[PDB]
């Protein structure tokens, strides 16, 4: 019985579905997703480091006292660990 | 001399800069960034598993021969390894 029609249909549907799943897999492996999260993390580290360098420099110069300098770094440190 | 003006300015700039750095840290510690990447990864796995379940079901029914069924799964497997 023509229902060879249904089998033929089911088979090409499955093949076309495979393509859709392969596209998903490609969009995954080609994602910049994690990489983008890590790049942002890197910006923050560098921003934090450059500012902290300045707190230290201000302390060397006597613009901050040692405790003042240490309190600022301690606040950054405290932020970092929640 | 004031210049005590400059020192006063430098100290408050350093404090305000500290707030900008803490804002960055908070904004990254509150990042749902990695989570969102992993969530999508999870959608893809589930999409692929559901389809794969159907390839298997079709093979059981005789709609695909065993080699056909195995080929499709083998193609998805290949994509997963690029």
From Swiss-Prot, chains A, B:
Belongs to the UPF0358 family. This is UPF0358 protein EF_2458. It comes from Enterococcus faecalis (strain ATCC 700802 / V583). The lineage of its organism: Bacteria, Bacillati, Bacillota, Bacilli, Lactobacillales. The chain holds residues 1 to 82 of 101 of the full protein.
């Amino acid at each position: 019985m023509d229902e060879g029609i249904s089998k033929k249909f089911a088979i090409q549907l499955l093949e076309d579905d495979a393509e859709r799943i392969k596209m998903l897999i490609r969009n995954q492996k080609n994602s910049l997703c994690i990489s983008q999260c890590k790049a942002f993390e890197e910006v923050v580290d560098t921003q934090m480091y450059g500012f902290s360098r300045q707190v230290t420099y201000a302390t060397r110069l006597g613009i901050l006292t040692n405790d003042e300098g240490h309190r600022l770094l301690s606040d950054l440190e405290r932020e970092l660990n929640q």
